[PDB]
Structure formats: structure tokens, C-alpha cells
Design a protein around this ligand. Structure first.
Ligand SMILES: O=C(O)C1=C[C@H](O)[C@@H](O)[C@H](O[C@H]2[C@H](OS(=O)(=O)O)[C@@H](NS(=O)(=O)O)[C@@H](O)O[C@@H]2COS(=O)(=O)O)O1
Ligand code: CA
Length: 367
């Protein structure tokens, strides 16, 4: 039993993790639950401990991307999640409301707050077999949208109470950020569906003009794209993220430390290297220090810029290498939200790609 499937999955925004879903006391898994997607690997040890092998085959995109007809794939670990214990002391109804607002993980461990520096470390192991045209994020620092921040059909941006948001949710259903008239789904015969609880199955009707804050680019991502290893930092100072503003730097095209900018956003390639030069069949360790950009909430200003420092270490061809690949660079990095940031690693296959991805991750620590 050299590879042990870890198939349990948590919707961290909408559900607590049961203790039996927690991996090694500090992780939950998200994305496709195929046996091969995530496995504890006793054949590829790091620091005398099992690593995690991640694998998405061609057919393993189970999610939709932003554009029409686009798909994406996910098999990742999240360091942030809530448990039953996190709701100890709160009113009984707190959890139900957290599920609807998608704020359950707000109550959990693993959040680095707004404007709080933190250090991180992790290691990655890229097999020789990894295709050079993969399109995958293997480690990311993810933001936490304001879940009752909405835009009306008429175009007013406003944050509601939870109770008021629950009222809106009676007639609106949000698919990602986009509001639709809430309706009940029918079977192929035109008869109403009933769920396991005997309730109607709610469905998105036509768009109704409402928006809610949801998704957005990760403040920091490590990945491969177009034959490049890259580190990409994103910033968004708009109180309500505008998802139509596709401000994003290309590893291929964008030169290093030259931000692609919009009115509110910034996307910087902090570092890149040709895929061919990335060490294969060895552990590559990243030490990351982040000073988050700080924002003025409803004022939508950048208060202070951020900073990024990255060291990369490995052993290959009978020499140890240490390179200061991001050398204390002033950078814009973060999001204008109430809550801060959480780490994930694994596979997030983006850029409308189905090129297979398989590699190992281990040795995670934060401050
Ligand atoms: O659609 C884009 O602009 C885009 C292009 C990049 O090739 C891809 O890495 C990037 O993926 C986003 C993702 O968009 S997607 O269309 O859903 O895949 C985005 N989702 S969204 O719902 O907020 O738009 C989020 O998950 O971040 C992905 C990675 O972002 S970045 O690391 O490229 O900045 O989007
Ligand atoms: Ca926001």
C-alpha cells in the first residue's frame, strides 16, 4: 500500500469539516474526489514523512471557467477550514446562516488577517514525466470575499446585514457572483423535482441584475503555463471585485516585475523561468515572506504597498542550489476584503487545459 487514496472532500465555504475528513490534523481536500486525484505517497518521502501525490487526468476537469464553454480542474488541500468546535459558544443558528452566506471558513483556523505579514514554506517534486505545456497552479494564497457585499440591478454597491442577505436569497440565487431569479427545477417530464428532504430543487432562472462578491484571482500563485514556471501576484483595491476586469499577467508574454494594471487591479509576474530549467525528480523548497498590500475598504484606496521575498532551494546534479528568485520586491499583492488569506496547494488546472498533471507536495509550514 504505497499510495493511499484520500477521497474525502470539504466545501470549506459552506460546511464545517468533520474530524474524519481532516488530513494529518491540518488539511482538508477540495475538488474532484477520484481515488487517483489525491493520495498519500509513501514512495516519495520528504523529511522522513509521506508526501501528497496529486493527479488530474485529461478527463478530470469537473468545474467551469469564466469564459463560455471553458472548464477547469481542481484537486487541492486547504489549510483553512472550520470544524464543529469553531462554532462552540455561538448561537445555534450561526452555522445555518454561515452555510447560506458561504462564510463557514471565516470561523476556522489558517487565515492570515488583512495587513498581517506571514512567512510560509513548502516543497514540490516535479516528475520528468510532467508535460512542458501543463497549465496548473500548484500553490496559491487565496482571498476571502465579502459575502453580503452586493450590487443592485440599478448599480448601487452595498453591504447588507446577514439577515437582509438571507431575505434577498429568498428570491435570488447566485451562480458564482451572478444573481438569477430563483426558481424550482423540473424533471424531463415537466414535473417538479423533490430533493432527499422532500424540498424543491432550486435553480437559476434568468439573470436578474444582482451581483454578490465571489471568486477573484488569487493574491499569490505559483504555477506552470505556456512552458514557464512563474510566480504571479495580484491586487484588487475595489471594494466589490469587478470580475469583468480580466487584469492578469501572462507568464509567457509579461516581463518580470512589470505590472499589468487596470483602474483597480494589478497583476505582476514576480519571477519566471523556462519549464526546461525547473529541476525535475527532486524536491524544490520555497521560502516565502509576504507583506500584504493594505486597503481602505469602502474608501477603495491602497494604504501601503506590499512586499514579496522568495528563496528557492534544491539539490540536482550533485550540487545544492539556493537562489533568491524574488529578492525583497515591492509589489501589489492582496484584496480589499474584511478577511485575509489562506494557503492551498495541489492542482488547479486553468487556462482551459486538459493536459494531464501529476506531482507531489510536502513540508508545509506557516510562521
Ligand atoms: O480568465 C482569465 O482571465 C484567466 C486566465 C488565466 O489563464 C487563468 O490562470 C486564470 O484563472 C483564474 C480563474 O479564472 S477561470 O476563468 O475561472 O479559470 C479565477 N476565477 S474567477 O471566477 O474569479 O474568474 C480564479 O480562480 O483565479 C484563477 C487563477 O488566477 S491567476 O492565478 O491566473 O491570477 O484566469
Ligand atoms: Ca472586496
Amino acid at each position: 500500500e504505497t499510495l493511499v487514496p484520500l477521497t474525502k472532500r470539504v466545501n470549506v465555504q459552506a460546511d464545517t469539516a468533520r474530524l474524519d475528513q481532516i488530513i494529518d490534523g491540518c488539511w482538508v481536500a477540495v475538488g474532484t474526489n477520484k481515488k487517483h486525484a489525491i493520495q498519500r505517497d509513501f514512495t516519495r518521502l520528504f523529511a522522513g514523512k509521506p508526501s501528497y501525490r496529486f493527479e488530474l487526468r485529461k478527463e478530470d476537469n469537473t468545474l467551469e471557467g469564466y469564459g463560455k464553454g471553458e472548464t477547469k480542474g481542481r484537486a487541492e488541500f486547504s489549510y483553512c477550514y472550520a470544524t464543529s468546535a469553531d462554532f462552540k459558544g455561538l448561537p445555534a443558528d450561526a452555522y445555518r446562516k454561515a452555510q447560506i452566506t458561504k462564510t463557514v471558513y471565516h470561523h476556522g483556523k489558517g487565515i492570515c488577517p488583512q495587513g498581517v505579514s506571514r512567512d510560509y514554506e513548502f516543497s514540490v517534486y516535479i516528475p520528468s514525466a510532467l508535460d512542458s505545456n501543463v497549465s496548473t497552479i500548484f500553490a496559491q494564497w487565496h482571498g476571502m470575499p465579502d459575502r453580503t457585499l452586493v450590487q443592485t440591478p440599478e448599480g448601487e454597491v452595498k453591504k447588507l446585514t446577514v439577515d437582509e442577505f438571507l431575505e434577498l436569497d429568498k428570491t435570488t440565487i447566485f451562480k458564482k457572483n451572478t444573481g438569477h431569479e430563483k426558481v424550482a427545477k423540473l424533471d424531463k417530464q415537466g414535473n417538479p423535482l423533490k430533493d432527499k428532504k422532500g424540498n424543491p430543487v432550486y435553480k437559476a432562472g434568468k439573470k436578474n441584475g444582482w451581483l454578490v462578491e465571489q471568486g477573484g484571482y488569487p493574491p499569490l500563485a505559483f504555477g506552470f503555463s505556456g512552458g514557464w514556471f512563474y510566480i504571479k501576484a495580484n491586487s484588487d483595491r475595489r471594494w466589490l471585485t469587478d470580475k469583468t476586469d480580466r487584469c492578469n499577467a501572462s507568464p509567457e508574454k509579461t516581463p518580470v516585475m512589470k505590472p499589468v494594471t487596470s483602474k483597480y487591479k494589478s497583476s505582476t509576474i514576480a519571477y519566471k523561468m523556462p519549464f526546461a530549467d525547473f529541476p525535475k525528480d527532486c524536491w524544490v523548497t520555497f521560502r516565502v515572506h509576504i507583506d500584504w498590500t493594505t486597503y481602505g475598504k469602502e474608501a477603495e484606496n491602497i494604504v501601503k504597498p506590499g512586499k514579496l521575498d522568495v528563496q528557492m532551494e534544491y539539490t540536482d546534479k550533485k550540487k545544492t542550489v539556493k537562489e533568491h528568485i524574488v529578492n525583497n520586491e515591492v509589489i501589489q499583492i492582496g484584496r480589499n476584503d474584511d478577511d485575509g488569506y489562506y494557503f492551498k496547494f495541489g492542482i488547479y488546472r486553468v487556462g482551459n487545459s486538459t493536459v494531464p498533471v501529476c506531482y507531489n507536495l510536502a513540508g508545509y509550514k506557516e510562521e
